[PDB]
Amino acid sequence: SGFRKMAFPSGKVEGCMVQVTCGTTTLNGLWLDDVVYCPRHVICTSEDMLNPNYEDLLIRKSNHNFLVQAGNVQLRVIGHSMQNCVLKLKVDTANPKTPKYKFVRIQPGQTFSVLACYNGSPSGVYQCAMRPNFTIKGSFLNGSCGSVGFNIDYDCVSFCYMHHMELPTGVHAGTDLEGNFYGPFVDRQTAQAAGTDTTITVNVLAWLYAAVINGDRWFLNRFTTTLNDFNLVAMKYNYEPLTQDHVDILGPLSAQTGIAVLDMCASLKELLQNGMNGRTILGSALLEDEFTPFDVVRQCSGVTFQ
Amino acid sequence: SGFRKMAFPSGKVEGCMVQVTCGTTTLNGLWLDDVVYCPRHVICTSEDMLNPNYEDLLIRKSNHNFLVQAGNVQLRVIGHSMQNCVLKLKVDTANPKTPKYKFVRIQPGQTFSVLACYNGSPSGVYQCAMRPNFTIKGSFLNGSCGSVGFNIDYDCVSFCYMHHMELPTGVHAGTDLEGNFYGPFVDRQTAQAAGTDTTITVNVLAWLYAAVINGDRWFLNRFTTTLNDFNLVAMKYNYEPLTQDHVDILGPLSAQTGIAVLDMCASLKELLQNGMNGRTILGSALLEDEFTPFDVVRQCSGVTFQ
Ligand SMILES: O=C(c1cc(=O)[nH]c(=O)[nH]1)N1CCN(c2ccc(Br)c(Cl)c2)CC1
Numbered sequence: 001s002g003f004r005k006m007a008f009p010s011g012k013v014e015g016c017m018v019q020v021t022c023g024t025t026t027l028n029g030l031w032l033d034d035v036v037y038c039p040r041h042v043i044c045t046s047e048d049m050l051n052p053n054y055e056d057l058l059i060r061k062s063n064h065n066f067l068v069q070a071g072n073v074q075l076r077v078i079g080h081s082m083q084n085c086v087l088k089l090k091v092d093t094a095n096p097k098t099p100k101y102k103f104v105r106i107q108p109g110q111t112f113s114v115l116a117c118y119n120g121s122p123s124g125v126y127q128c129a130m131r132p133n134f135t136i137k138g139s140f141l142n143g144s145c146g147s148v149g150f151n152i153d154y155d156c157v158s159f160c161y162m163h164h165m166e167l168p169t170g171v172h173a174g175t176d177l178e179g180n181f182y183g184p185f186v187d188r189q190t191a192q193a194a195g196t197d198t199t200i201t202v203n204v205l206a207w208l209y210a211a212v213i214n215g216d217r218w219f220l221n222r223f224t225t226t227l228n229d230f231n232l233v234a235m236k237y238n239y240e241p242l243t244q245d246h247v248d249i250l251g252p253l254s255a256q257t258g259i260a261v262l263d264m265c266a267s268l269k270e271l272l273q274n275g276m277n278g279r280t281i282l283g284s285a286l287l288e289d290e291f292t293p294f295d296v297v298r299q300c301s302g303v304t305f306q
Numbered sequence: 307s308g309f310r311k312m313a314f315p316s317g318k319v320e321g322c323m324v325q326v327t328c329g330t331t332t333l334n335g336l337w338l339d340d341v342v343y344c345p346r347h348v349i350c351t352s353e354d355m356l357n358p359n360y361e362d363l364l365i366r367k368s369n370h371n372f373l374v375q376a377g378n379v380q381l382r383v384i385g386h387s388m389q390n391c392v393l394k395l396k397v398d399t400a401n402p403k404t405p406k407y408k409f410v411r412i413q414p415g416q417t418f419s420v421l422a423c424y425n426g427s428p429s430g431v432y433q434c435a436m437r438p439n440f441t442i443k444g445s446f447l448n449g450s451c452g453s454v455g456f457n458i459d460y461d462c463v464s465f466c467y468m469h470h471m472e473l474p475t476g477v478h479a480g481t482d483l484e485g486n487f488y489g490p491f492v493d494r495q496t497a498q499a500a501g502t503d504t505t506i507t508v509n510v511l512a513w514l515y516a517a518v519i520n521g522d523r524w525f526l527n528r529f530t531t532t533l534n535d536f537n538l539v540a541m542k543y544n545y546e547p548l549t550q551d552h553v554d555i556l557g558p559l560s561a562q563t564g565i566a567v568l569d570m571c572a573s574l575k576e577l578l579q580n581g582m583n584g585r586t587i588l589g590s591a592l593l594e595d596e597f598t599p600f601d602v603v604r605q606c607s608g609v610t611f612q
Pocket residue numbers: 041044048049052140141142143144145164165166172186187188189307
C-alpha cells in the first residue's frame with residue numbers, strides 16, 4: 001500500500017538524449033534511429049528571438065553549423081530539415097539503444113513522465129499532467145529545452161512532449177514530437193499568456209478512490225447525486241464537467257471499492273462546498289488532480305513493464 | 307523555474323534488477339558484479355514466517371534451490387551466503403551493466419529515489435525521505451521486496467535501501483545493502499510498530515527557501531528569532547530541533563535569497579502558531595518536509611549527472 005507521485009523508469013529514454021549546439025546556443029536533442037529531434041529555436045540568436053523567420057534562418061545554415069554530441073562521441077550531421085516547430089537532424093550513425101517507440105499527442109488531463117536534461121545529460125525524472133489550458137506545471141531551468149515527456153506502454157515508449165519554453169507565469173509550454181505546439185503558443189520570445197486553468201474532475205475522483213483503497217474513508221457519505229446535479233456544482237468551482245465516458249473509465253475503481261461513481265461524486269460535492277476542515281486525504285490538504293484513473297490502477301493494483 | 311518531487315534517473319539501476327525465486331516465493335534481486343543481493347526472507351515458507359531460524363533454513367538449501375532470472379537469461383547460482391538480513395547469491399556471470407557503485411547508510415531526514423520492481427522488472431520511480439522513526443512512506447504492493455533505494459553522486463550510484471516489509475500502519479521498513487535494518491525492526495511476520503514520527507525541520511526550511519526562489523513570499527515577515535526561542539516552539543509542534551549545523555547547511559539558500567536562516571525561522575514560527583489561513587506554498591496547503599537543502603539547490607540552481 002501507499003501512494004506516491006510515481007514516474008516511469010527512465011532508462012530507455014536516457015540512452016536517447018544528446019546535446020545539440022548551433023553557434024553559441026546549446027540544448028537537448030532526442031536521438032532515435034539516425035534522426036536527432038530538437039526545438040527549432042536552437043537556430044535563433046538574440047536578434048531573431050522577438051520575430052524569427054525560421055525559413056530564412058534555416059536556409060542560411062549548413063550541416064557543419066550543427067554540433068551533436070552523444071556523451072563524448074560526436075555525431076556527424078549529414079542532413080537537416082524542419083517539421084513544424086521541431087528540427088530534424090539526420091546523422092551518420094543510428095542510435096543502437098533506440099527503443100521501440102511511437103509519437104503520440106496526448107489530451108488535457110493525461111499524465112506523463114518528464115526526463116529533465118541539461119547539456120544532453122539526464123538530471124531528474126518527474127510526473128506531471130497536461131493542464132486543461134495546454135500548459136504543464138514543470139520544473140525546468142535554463143538549458144532544459146528539448147527535454148522530453150513520455151509514457152511507457154508495455155515495452156514501447158510513447159513520446160508525447162518536447163519542452164520549448166517557460167511562460168511568464170512560471171508554467172511551461174512545448175510541442176508534440178511532430179512539432180505541433182500544445183496550446184495557442186508560438187516559439188518566439190513575445191509576451192504570451194495561458195488561458196485560465198480548471199481542475200481535472202475525473203482525476204480528483206480517481207484520487208479519492210486511491211484514498212479509499214489506502215484506508216482514508218472519512219469523506220464518504222451515504223448520499224448520491226446525478227451527473228447533472230454534480231456538474232452544476234462543479235461548474236461553480238472551476239471544475240471540468242463530468243461525462244458518462246468518465247464514469248465508465250472509473251468503473252474498475254468503483255468495482256474494487258464497491259463505491260459507485262455517483263456516490264463518490266456526492267462526497268466530492270460536499271468537499272467542494274464545506275472544505276476539508278483541517279483533515280487530509282493521502283497526506284494532502286488539497287484535492288489532487290494530477291493522477292489519472294489508469295495511474296491509480298497501476299499503483300493500487302500493479303502493472304510492471306519489460 | 308517550478309518545483310517538483312524529482313527522482314534520480316533510474317537507468318543505471320534498471321540494468322541491475324533480477325528476479326529471485328526460492329521454492330514458491332519470488333522477489334527482486336540486485337545484481338552487481340557476480341553477486342545477487344536480496345532479502346533473506348525469500349527462504350521462508352508459511353510455517354517459518356512467524357519465528358524463522360535463518361541459519362537452519364539456509365543450511366537446508368543448495369545452490370540449485372535458487373532460481374535467478376535476468377529478463378530471459380538464467381543465471382547459475384554457484385554459491386550462497388548470508389550477511390545480516392541480506393542473502394548474497396554468487397552467480398557464474400558478472401553483470402556487464404554494473405555501474406560504479408557504493409553502499410551507504412543514510413540518516414533520518416535524507417532523501418533517496420526508490421525503483422519499485424515486480425518480478426525483476428522496474429515499474430516506477432519515486433522520491434522519498436527516511437523518516438525520523440526509520441520508516442519510509444513508500445508505495446509498494448505484493449511482490450516488491452528487494453526493490454532498492456539509491457542516490458546518484460556524479461557518475462556513482464549510492465545504494466542505501468533494500469525493501470523488506472510493510473508495517474501494519476502502511477509504512478515501509480528495510481535494510482541498508484549490508485543487511486542492517488533501518489530502525490528497531492526484524493524480518494519476521496510479527497506485530498511491530500514504528501515509533502512516533504516527527505517533522506524534519508531543516509527540510510521544511512529548505513522548502514520555504516524554494517518557495518521564495520519561485521516567487522511565493524506571502525509568509526515572510528521582518529522579525530527574527532534565536533535558535534533556542536525557535537526550538538522551544540518547534541518542540542511543542544513535534545518538530546525536530548534545529549542545530550547550528552542545520553543553519554550552515556542552509557547557507558547557500560540564505561545567500562541566494564538574501565534571507566537569513568533565523569529570519570526564515572521566525573516565518574516558520576508564525577506558520578506553526580497561526581496556520582496558512584487557506585493560502586498555499588508551492589501548491590501545497592501543508593508544510594512539506596521531504597526535500598533536503600541539497601534537493602532544493604539541485605532543482606533551483608541546477609546539477610546534472612553523467
Ligand atoms: O532554457 C531555457 C529555459 C526553459 C525553461 O523552462 N525555463 C528557464 O528558465 N529557461 N530557455 C528559455 C527559452 N529560450 C528560448 C530561446 C529562443 C526562443 Br525563439 C524561445 Cl521561444 C525560447 C531558450 C532558453
